[PDB]
Amino acid sequence: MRDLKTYLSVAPVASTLWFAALAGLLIEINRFFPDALTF
Amino acid sequence: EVKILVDRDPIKTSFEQWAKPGHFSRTIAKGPDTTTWIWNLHADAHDFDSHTSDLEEISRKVFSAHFGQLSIIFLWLSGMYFHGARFSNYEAWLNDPTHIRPSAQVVWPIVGQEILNGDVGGGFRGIQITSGFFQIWRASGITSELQLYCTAIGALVFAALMLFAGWFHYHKAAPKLVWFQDVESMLNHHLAGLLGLGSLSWAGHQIHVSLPINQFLNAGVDPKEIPLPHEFILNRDLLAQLYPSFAEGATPFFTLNWSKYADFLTFRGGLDPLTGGLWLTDIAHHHLAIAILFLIAGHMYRTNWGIGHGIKDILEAHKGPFTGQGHKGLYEILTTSWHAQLSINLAMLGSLTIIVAHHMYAMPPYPYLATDYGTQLSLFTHHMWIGGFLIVGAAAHAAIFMVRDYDPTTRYNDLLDRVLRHRDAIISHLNWVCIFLGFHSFGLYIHNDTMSALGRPQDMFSDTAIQLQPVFAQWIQNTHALAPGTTAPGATTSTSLTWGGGDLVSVGGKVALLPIPLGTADFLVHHIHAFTIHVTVLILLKGVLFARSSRLIPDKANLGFRFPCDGPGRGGTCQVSAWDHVFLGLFWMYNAISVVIFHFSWKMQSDVWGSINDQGVVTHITGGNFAQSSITINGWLRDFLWAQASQVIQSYGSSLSAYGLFFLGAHFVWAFSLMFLFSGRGYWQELIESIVWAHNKLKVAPATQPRALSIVQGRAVGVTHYLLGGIATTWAFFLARIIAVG
Amino acid sequence: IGSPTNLIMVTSTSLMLFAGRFGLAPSANRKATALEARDSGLQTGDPAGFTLADTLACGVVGHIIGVGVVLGLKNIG
Amino acid sequence: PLWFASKQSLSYLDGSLPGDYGFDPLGLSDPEGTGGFIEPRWLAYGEVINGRFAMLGAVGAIAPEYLGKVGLIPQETALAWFQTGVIPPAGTYNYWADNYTLFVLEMALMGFAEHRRFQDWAKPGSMGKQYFLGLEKGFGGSGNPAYPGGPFFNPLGFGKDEKSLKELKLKEVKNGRLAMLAILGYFIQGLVTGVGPYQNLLDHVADPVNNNVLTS
Amino acid sequence: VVQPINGDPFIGSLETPVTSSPLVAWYLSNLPGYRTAVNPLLRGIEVGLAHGFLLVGPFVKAGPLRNTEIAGQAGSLAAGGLVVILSICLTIYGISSFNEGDPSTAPSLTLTGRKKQPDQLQTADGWAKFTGGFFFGGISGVIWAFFLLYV
């Protein structure tokens, strides 16, 4: 379990989770406030 | 004594090694000093040789990894069936296959991307697919999304079963070495078992499900009203009304009155004219006969009894005056070197895929496939690339075998030694024939371009000037067309409508196949193919024959399979490694396959594909322009690339615009690859030094010291982006063009 | 009987089983090269070195010869 | 006595096996390099367990067919094996529950019994340990997983001594083997004739010449 | 069958049915270029005769006038023109390779290993006479084909 938590922290795994979370956030901002060119 | 031999609990299942990057390698496991560590971790992940020298422990790794691959394929098929079930117009497509465009992917509405949901028919909006799954499911008698849902669940189950087996056969019950080496048992079980019982059991589905359901579809009855497949098993009279051979049941089979089954087991040939595909009664009779051949062939090699050969006996018995001892010693090599096995299998699997490309276009095996010009151009191209990649892989592991596994003291072989003893005669001969081919193929084009530019079209190699008629191919064509009445009496029509003769088959006003004419232009592009393939073999074969040594580098084998060079001396030794020959052969494989698929696209649009009239006036897509245009390079520039690129460069603003973006994107990645191929890591490492200084100035340098890619990586990165950008460009160019005009 | 094809099948089946029971075809205790005697290891209630797998071998080949002959004659006359 | 035995199958089948006829033409119980479910101790257990279920099945898959033709159970509850709802496309019958609801009760009841049984094979001393409605007094096994006995599985006291138990195990085994072939018989005769097993037994007496495996 | 060249397995060549067979070794030792003790001038005359005669074919039948009445004359002039330029290549090859005093750089041994006099073709004058024979032979061989084909 602690071995698993170490693996889940390895560069690639932490990157997909980080960027997945990022992509979801940016997608939903674009679903709620689409087509923003100003600001 | 061929028996099941397994070791119990070899490797403990633990996440301990997941937490330790590079555990498999003793060097990598210590951890990174530099960024180069990151890349070697990945480059060495599947190089099971470098992890362990024990052949048993290597075999266990490749065995469970194979289960891993099979798991991935089943999961891949699960999604294909699931999308057909949940996000497709397959049910609507069954009612109108001539018009409705297959679609099995739908994009969510975000950032304007809904435009990729195209008006494909059937009251559906989605991306037009070219994998051809719809023609498969129809030929399988699949009639509803419910049937695809169940196939997707079964595929998902098989994916779990295959993954379980991989963990099981590595951590719980791992076969011993001698179990893997029983090549006689394996060959028997694959011929009779996999190939035989696969073709027989699939023949059963074709008989009891695929034949009857397609007869209702072709008669015109609605799929929602066609009897479910199990009703042709529960009630034989349903079958007997379509094929009265089923009335007598399995009796005519055992009484050798096989001719009684001539209504669902045939030898007609040609294409079902109302569907455009091969006769499903010819196909079912094909799998039947094919299944018989493999079930008996799986009895050739000796196992736990007396009958059968030892494969070693057959090898050790073939040898001539020019060869000496012959195939002696090959059985020890092919039972102790995984790379020798992988080289042969890649060679044949690759070659076989290229054949599948040809046979599937000239003998369309699926209903309404031949007239889906987009699916058929995709299938031929897809399998050419897959085939060409696998072939280049054969040369690498042939080269890897020579560096790592070749040992004349323990596992000698006089055939391999005899070739090594005259590799200079082989490579110099292949060098000259390549120079001959290049001059007498591509040089003729240059002749034509120069003649045509000077206002002298009478001096060209053309059908209307100096003609180079492919007499031998023309002869073979005219032969096969006369086979059904003569040399193949049981055959009604030719095996393919391509066979120069016969007539034509159309589906929905679109031409499926007609006789393909072969003239001067076909002569030229065929000698380009022979030229490009020869140079590909020259580079790759040279790489394996001098993998151990050369007059320039006498101890090359000690430098390994994959190494940048042996320095600037001897005038310069960059790219002497066998690995670098594979690097150079990929570019030439890419070249060769690119003009093969270009040859395919232009010929089909020019002389085959098109629309047929009410009276039979065929209008081909590019109107026969192949004959006078494809004999100069300017003809390919102007009449092929410049003209057919219209669709992709005006795809913006329509559902084909994603091809527009991929067209430009792949150009970008291709140009980006040239940065790696044209430069060298010394420049980059010095650049990074100035950048590292800047980071140090602000206390932001990483402890993992940044390094330029290794010399070999630079080359690997270069060729990878070169192939990806190159091929993706043609992908986006082909699909936009064929979906817009097909 | 019901048919003359019955005569052709039992002929090839009995003749092939005959060619392996005593000799004139490779048995499980008699491999071939270009017939070297050997031992298999699967005992039988048949004392001629004729094994259980050997009856299947000739029995299958006896049908392959027969069916090829039966359908060869049937597709001619 | 040896049923097609070999001088390598005799190396590990030492006769100390109920039903040891030495038959192993593929060397399946070979103790060299075992693992998984290909294991000597486990294969004997699987022979016995499959043998016991087949004895219940070979009788039960022909008992309503036999009792029905005589007229001993109602003609609306006397069925062939493949037409009771086990294979709905071949035959159904309205029981007190749905055909799928019954299977849930089956796997629920068969779960408890087959799960607890597996623990005596894994941890022999168990099952008698953890409480279970006081029923755990007769769930301690015997050190033999396949022959636990006790007040629940040997309530009458058979296999009283050595010469009786091995004579009982030897007969218990050979019956399951024939019942397993019977279960195999009912299956192929069903798909090739479409009729029940006992009827196939009948028509081979009413006309052995024209009702045979060669006629179908 | 396939032996080491002259029994020496460490010379960079092989002796195969193509390199050294009784018929191969006879035909190759009978070509004018392997007549090591005969006059190099007469070698080149036979060489030029055979080549200039061969060159008339492709020039006439494939040239830019191949389908005209000026065909035989033009490709023949183009054939002699190819002999003229080749004779310059043969000449400058000799001026650069051989000096006015050097001995023959030809093998002085035989297949059995005995000492013979080297092929004087591989000398300055022996080359000068060979290329002189080629030029005379090549011009007349062009004319001889031009004689038989269009006269």
Ligand code: CLA
């Ligand atoms: C080769 C297989 C394959 C491919 C390429 C796709 C591709 C697609 N599917 Mg599909 N699908 C497949 C198999 C596949 N599917 C199978 C087998 C099933 C049945 C189970 C489905 C069921 C399915 C449904 C029900 C839907 C799709 C949808 C989609 C589309 C959007 C998916 C998306 O954005 O997810 C969102 C992205 C994520 C969930 C990724 C999250 C990122 C995390 C962090 C990654 C985790 C990484 C981790 C380390 C490893 C985890 C492994 C774990 C599984 C053990 C996309 C075109 C959607 C669609 O078409 O909508 C119109 C949709 O609704 N699919």
Ligand code: CLA
């Ligand atoms: C949770 C289950 C589990 C656990 C804890 C282990 C634990 C272990 N296994 Mg095992 N194994 C399992 C399941 C498991 N295995 C299964 C299902 C299989 C069948 C494939 C195997 C096959 C197997 C082999 C063949 C080997 C091991 C090895 C190991 C050891 C280290 C492996 C390692 O670093 O993994 C971490 C590795 C990964 C996380 C890689 C991911 C694996 C999947 C298949 C990748 C698929 C990704 C796919 C391509 C998508 C990517 C493409 C796209 C994103 C671009 C460790 C003792 C190795 C060993 O002991 O050698 C010293 C070894 O050689 N195992």
Ligand code: CLA
């Ligand atoms: C069944 C097929 C097969 C198998 C089992 C192998 C197996 C192997 N090969 Mg081989 N090979 C194959 C086919 C195969 N190859 C083919 C077809 C080619 C021709 C391209 C080669 C060329 C080749 C070379 C040149 C080398 C090997 C090497 C190896 C060994 C190490 C592999 C490793 O660790 O890579 C780890 C895998 C990776 C790091 C993956 C890299 C990512 C790839 C290159 C890009 C994929 C792009 C993708 C398709 C598109 C997505 C883009 C997207 C992400 C944006 C291993 C024994 C190496 C060796 O030394 O052997 C001992 C080696 O140097 N092979």
Ligand code: CLA
């Ligand atoms: C369009 C670009 C191009 C061209 C023309 C060539 C040409 C050649 N490459 Mg090459 N190559 C290229 C790109 C190119 N390469 C790239 C990008 C790579 C990197 C992957 C390589 C990697 C590579 C390798 C690894 C190999 C080759 C080989 C070859 C040769 C093949 C034999 C042949 O056809 O000779 C005939 C020559 C031609 C067909 C070129 C055109 C000739 C013209 C039309 C005739 C001119 C007549 C006359 C001279 C007029 C000029 C007069 C003037 C002096 C006034 C040939 C010289 C192979 C080789 O050497 O095999 C022998 C080989 O092994 N190349």
Ligand code: CLA
């Ligand atoms: C090509 C793949 C492959 C190969 C070569 C093997 C090879 C092996 N496995 Mg293995 N296995 C595989 C896939 C594979 N397995 C899969 C996918 C699973 C997951 C279910 C397993 C699960 C598994 C277990 C749990 C065990 C093995 C065992 C064994 C060994 C002995 C097997 C044997 O003959 O027992 C005899 C085989 C049987 C008694 C099975 C007969 C009936 C089954 C159901 C086969 C039916 C499969 C058939 C082709 C499917 C048709 C479906 C169609 C009709 C619809 C042997 C090394 C055993 C072992 O460790 O031996 C030492 C063992 O205990 N395997």
Ligand SMILES: CC1=C(/C=C/C(C)=C/C=C/C(C)=C/C=C/C=C(C)/C=C/C=C(C)/C=C/C2=C(C)CCCC2(C)C)C(C)(C)CCC1
């Ligand atoms: C699509 C798909 C799928 C599915 C599949 C399937 C559905 C399959 C099936 C299959 C099957 C279902 C099979 C079957 C088989 C069978 C067999 C293979 C049989 C055999 C037989 C035999 C061999 C015979 C014998 C004999 C003889 C010879 C003589 C007389 C007697 C007897 C009859 C015994 C999955 C999900 C996976 C995945 C995804 C995709």
Ligand SMILES: CC1=C(/C=C/C(C)=C/C=C/C(C)=C/C=C/C=C(C)/C=C/C=C(C)/C=C/C2=C(C)CCCC2(C)C)C(C)(C)CCC1
């Ligand atoms: C011992 C003895 C004896 C003898 C016996 C007998 C006489 C028997 C015979 C034997 C037999 C009687 C055998 C046979 C067998 C058979 C088999 C084994 C078969 C098989 C078949 C098959 C396998 C087929 C298949 C196929 C093919 C191959 C082709 C295609 C089609 C088909 C699918 C049909 C006596 C009495 C004298 C005395 C005492 C002792």
Ligand SMILES: CC1=C(C/C=C(\C)CCC[C@H](C)CCC[C@H](C)CCCC(C)C)C(=O)c2ccccc2C1=O
């Ligand atoms: C451009 C290129 C350079 C430099 C390019 C290298 C250094 C690639 C850099 C790869 C990545 C971008 C480095 C950073 C990777 C980290 C994982 C990034 C983390 C940040 C988050 C966003 C993930 C050389 O290494 C050289 C190698 C030899 C032949 C010529 C080539 C080549 O031309």
Ligand code: SF4
């Ligand atoms: S340039 Fe790069 S590859 Fe070529 S020799 Fe120098 S270091 Fe080695």
